[PDB]
Structure formats: structure tokens, C-alpha cells
């Protein structure tokens, strides 16, 4: 569990994300796919995007990033009290999309990279550690739900 101070650092940087959710979501996807191209294979639509400029020009991808960050933001704002929000996400990611926990590690890395790239003055070592803990809690709780659903992930 995170301390109150750690949650405040998480939500402080999250407020910066909320100034441009769409742009952050695009950058996170592009960073994830560049670092781990196998993840781009899970999007039947997005996997045919060939260049960074094509990725930025995709309204579908931009909309998807807002959907992703809206879901993650709603979870983070619960400060760990997120079972109701997390359960449907685990259901779809385990049973329909088949997303292994390691891919959630990859997107967590991309999130931290983009947040530090855009907001270094609000995302130093302490805030990075807090965000790392919050995303680790998210992944640990998702992994438990995966197992409950019969998916080892
Ligand atoms: C922070 C982690 C993530 C969050 C909050 C998140 C959230 C979402 C949401 C809200 C949706 C739409 C509703 C649904 O189907 O559940 C979605 C769909 C989907 N997600 Fe994720 N997701 C995450 C990570 C990933 C990763 C790492 C992958 C693949 C490597 C992935 C693959 C997909 C796919 C294939 C879909 C359905 C196709 C689409 O709607 O674009 N997700 N995700």
C-alpha cells in the first residue's frame, strides 16, 4: 500500500496528464510499440500503421488512448480502492484481448517514460517511485483477477 504522500505525488503528476490526455495517450502508445513491437500485434487495426506520423494522424488511436488513460486515471484516483473499476478491465484483458502481465509491465514503463519526458519538474525520483508503486499495485491486483478468471497471464 502507498503512503498518502505517495498517492499525492501520483495524483499531482496525473493532473498534468489531464491537461492533454489525448497527446499523452498517443505518446504512450508510440513509445510502447517502439520499445516492444510485439505489443502492437494485439491491435488488429493499429498494427497496419507504419510510421510515427501515421500513428499520430490516427483518430482511432487517439480516441483509444483517451479511453485507456481514462480507465487508468479512474483507478489511480481510488488510491488502491479500485476493485470495482479493475474487475471489468481484468475480465476483458484476460478473457478477450489476452494481454499478459508482462505487456502491462511494458506499458507501465512507457507511461513512466512519457511522464518524465514531458513533466520532469513534477516527476523526479520520489514521484517516479510513487508512480512505480501505484502501477505495480495495479498490475498485482490485475494478475490476481486474471488467476481468478483462469488466465495465468
Ligand atoms: C494501463 C493499462 C491498460 C489499460 C488501463 C487499458 C484499458 C483499456 C480499455 C478501457 C479498453 C476498452 C474496453 C475494454 O475492452 O476493456 C481497452 C481495450 C483493449 N486493450 Fe487495453 N488497456 C491497458 C493495457 C493494454 C495493453 C498493454 C494491451 C496490448 C499490448 C492492450 C490491448 C487492448 C486491446 C487489444 C483492446 C481492444 C481493442 C481496442 O479496443 O482497441 N491493453 N483497454
Swiss-Prot record:
Belongs to the globin family. Its EC number is 1.7.-.-, 1.11.1.-. The keyword NAD does not apply. Monomeric. Keywords: Cytoplasm, Heme, Iron, Metal-binding, Muscle protein, Oxidoreductase, Oxygen transport, Phosphoprotein, Transport. The modification Phosphothreonine is found at residue 67. Changing residue 121 to A: In metmyoglobin. Monomeric heme protein which primary function is to store oxygen and facilitate its diffusion within muscle tissues. Reversibly binds oxygen through a pentacoordinated heme iron and enables its timely and efficient release as needed during periods of heightened demand. Depending on the oxidative conditions of tissues and cells, and in addition to its ability to bind oxygen, it also has a nitrite reductase activity whereby it regulates the production of bioactive nitric oxide. It catalyses: Fe(III)-heme b-[protein] + nitric oxide + H2O = Fe(II)-heme b-[protein] + nitrite + 2 H(+); H2O2 + AH2 = A + 2 H2O. Its main location: cytoplasm. This is Myoglobin. Nitrite binds at residue 64. It comes from the Eukaryota. It is found in: Cytoplasm, Sarcoplasm. It holds the Pfam family Globin. InterPro entries: Globin, Globin-like_sf, Myoglobin. It comes from Physeter macrocephalus (Sperm whale). Heme b binds at residue 93. It is an enzyme of class 1 (oxidoreductase). The keyword Cytoplasm applies. The modification Phosphoserine is found at residue 3. GO terms for cellular component: extracellular exosome; sarcoplasm. One of its GO terms (biological process) is removal of superoxide radicals. O2 binds at residue 64. The gene is MB. Residues 1-147 form the Globin domain. PANTHER family: MYOGLOBIN.
Amino acid at each position: 500500500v502507498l503512503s498518502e504522500g505517495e498517492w499525492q505525488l501520483v495524483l499531482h503528476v496525473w493532473a498534468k496528464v489531464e491537461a492533454d490526455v489525448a497527446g499523452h495517450g498517443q505518446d504512450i502508445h508510440i513509445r510502447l510499440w517502439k520499445s516492444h513491437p510485439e505489443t502492437l500485434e494485439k491491435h488488429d487495426r493499429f498494427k497496419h500503421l507504419k510510421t510515427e506520423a501515421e500513428m499520430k494522424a490516427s483518430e482511432d488511436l487517439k480516441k483509444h488512448g483517451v479511453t485507456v488513460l481514462t480507465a487508468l486515471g479512474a483507478i489511480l484516483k481510488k488510491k488502491g480502492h479500485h476493485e470495482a473499476e479493475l474487475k471489468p478491465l481484468a475480465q476483458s484483458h484476460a478473457t478477450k484481448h489476452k494481454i499478459p502481465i508482462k505487456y502491462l509491465e511494458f506499458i507501465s514503463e512507457a507511461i513512466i517514460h512519457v511522464l518524465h519526458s514531458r513533466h520532469p519538474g513534477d516527476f523526479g525520483a520520489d514521484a517516479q517511485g510513487a508512480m512505480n508503486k501505484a502501477l505495480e499495485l495495479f498490475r498485482k491486483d490485475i494478475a490476481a483477477k486474471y488467476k481468478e478468471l483462469g488466465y495465468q497471464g
